[PDB]
Design a protein around this ligand. Structure first.
Ligand SMILES: Cc1cc2nc3c(=O)[nH]c(=O)nc-3n(C[C@H](O)[C@H](O)[C@H](O)COP(=O)(O)OP(=O)(O)OC[C@H]3O[C@@H](n4cnc5c(N)ncnc54)[C@H](O)[C@@H]3O)c2cc1C
Ligand SMILES: Cc1cc2nc3c(=O)[nH]c(=O)nc-3n(C[C@H](O)[C@H](O)[C@H](O)COP(=O)(O)OP(=O)(O)OC[C@H]3O[C@@H](n4cnc5c(N)ncnc54)[C@H](O)[C@@H]3O)c2cc1C
Ligand SMILES: COc1ccc2c([nH]1)c(CCNC(=O)c1ccco1)c1c3ncccc3cn21
Ligand SMILES: COc1ccc2c([nH]1)c(CCNC(=O)c1ccco1)c1c3ncccc3cn21
Ligand SMILES: [Zn+2]
Ligand SMILES: [Zn+2]
Lengths: 228, 227
């Protein structure tokens, strides 16, 4: 038995991202997995890192440091409840899937906000207790990303450079840093340009991959893998 | 003369980021430059890309495509006023400085939101106006970043890898894509672990660099430079 959290960042239920999220839910549910989705836009998830995220007495009310105060709030259990709700989902998950369209070679701001606010010191990592020693060790993570650009544009000699280049801050800087084992990304290239057959094919490829996801090994999340 | 926009993303006026923004204002003002600051947290800037970003009626009320809708809204002068207020500042700017603490090898979400919502198709880029032909061509941009990790950690064989690795999506994927000439990043490594005078020294070096900012040539914003 396994628990899966899908963190989902798209405004439109009928979108290609919506479909990839839905097929994930369908297929994991079919397998008998326990599945939770955080639909960030539907939740109106707060992306801003602010002093509203701590409810108790601040450690240093004279000079607000978000990282310091949230670390302390985590230990004290005085974080805002929207944060702790997400932390509970992550804590219990065996696999966390991020489903999102690429926005400026990265995640949409609403999802960046989830990373900034949910993955606080004490919960996701400590010093020491990061990268291979991160607090979310044992967990798997996977980026399921859609793009405007074609596969050709995301090559070493394409205009955008290789797709692995933009994965670095997310796979290494974030997921690996927290101790996740990172599974190979699912990149669904240019669904807007693609034909009806091609789009249905990309959806089916994701569904098919998920059939055997529990048998996958993670990538070596290193500079070499990303950059060569 | 010259116009500068500083897009600033820190919660605390007394912060090291706050000090860097303040000396940028001081020095550029001293030079006679026109200076505007977008203090995102003070503005409670909206980071989320939503249908509220379009006023009046949507291009397609049945299926919402943020990219299409905002492109059309830009052309039809129907974007939300927070977005258009920022676009005006950007349009008029000769130099855009981003001042922020590194969050997860990237910009804080509030600043990511500024990028997502302000830099829409038709304004910041289109086909074929991208990279070298981007619609903001002729403008300069500069990332002024502070880190928690020390300089040593950001070496190519350090735990975090080279600083240039995380700069790719921001400098190339975003700034260069919009046509910006990208000035060398100002990176202030690990201010929190002091010292008082080392902190004073980093602030001072930023101020000093700003003295001859208009003399600078942009970096070659390429895969080779970063990797
Ligand atoms: C702010 C912003 C920044 C961006 N930055 C980048 C960037 O840096 N790099 C880049 O490459 N792109 C970028 N993009 C483009 C963006 O990544 C793409 O528009 C997005 O990935 C497309 O996903 P959606 O979902 O597609 P949709 O438009 O929703 O899907 C395309 C088509 O697929 C159809 N469809 C939905 N479900 C199915 C299904 N089950 N079977 C068959 N068809 C289906 C839909 O009806 C639609 O017609 C950016 C976009 C924005 C708005
Ligand atoms: C969500 C989140 C994600 C993060 N991700 C990363 C990451 O991926 N990689 C990474 O390396 N780091 C990361 N960090 C750490 C973060 O980048 C640093 O905490 C931040 O850069 C420090 O800058 P600051 O302005 O907040 O420092 P401050 O704490 O504000 O400054 C340090 C000290 O300088 C003092 N000071 C202010 N002005 C002056 C002055 N003029 N002269 C002398 N002293 C002065 C202040 O009083 C303070 O005591 C993350 C932090 C958070 C909260
Ligand atoms: C403050 O609160 C926070 C919150 C989140 C952080 C964070 N600090 C740091 C910096 C951690 N300290 C140090 O390396 C340090 C302290 C002294 C010398 O080096 C980092 C990251 N560094 C790399 C990759 C992802 C990171 C997320 N985060
Ligand atoms: C309006 O919707 C948007 C908003 C912002 C975008 C965007 N599309 C695209 C994809 C642009 N299309 C194509 O490559 C393309 C070619 C042929 C058909 O499509 C990109 C980016 N691509 C690379 C780097 C940054 C980017 C920012 N943005
Ligand atoms: Zn890694
Ligand atoms: Zn470039």
């Amino acid at each position: 038995g396994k628990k899966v959290l899908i963190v989902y960042a798209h405004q439109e239920p009928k979108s290609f991202n919506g479909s990839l999220k839905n097929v994930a839910v369908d297929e994991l549910s079919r397998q008998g997995c326990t599945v939770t989705v955080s639909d960030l836009y539907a939740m109106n998830f707060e992306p801003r890192a602010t002093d509203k995220d701590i409810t108790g007495t601040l450690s240093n009310p004279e000079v607000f440091n978000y990282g310091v105060e949230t670390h302390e709030a985590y230990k004290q259990r005085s974080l805002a409840s929207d944060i702790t709700d997400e932390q509970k989902k992550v804590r219990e998950a065996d696999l966390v899937i991020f489903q999102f369209p690429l926005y400026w070679f990265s995640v949409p701001a609403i999802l960046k906000g989830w990373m900034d606010r949910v993955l606080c010191q004490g919960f996701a990592f400590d010093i020491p207790g990061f990268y291979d020693s991160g607090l979310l060790q044992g967990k798997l993570a996977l980026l399921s990303v859609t793009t405007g650009g074609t596969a050709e544009m995301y090559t070493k000699t394409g205009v955008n450079g290789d797709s692995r280049y933009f994965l670095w801050p997310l796979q290494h800087g974030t997921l690996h840093f927290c101790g996740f084992k990172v599974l190979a990304p699912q990149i669904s290239f240019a669904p807007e340009i693609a034909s009806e057959e091609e789009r249905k094919g990309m959806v089916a490829a994701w569904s098919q991959r998920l059939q055997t996801i529990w048998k996958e090994e993670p990538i070596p999340c290193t500079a070499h893998w990303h950059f060569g």
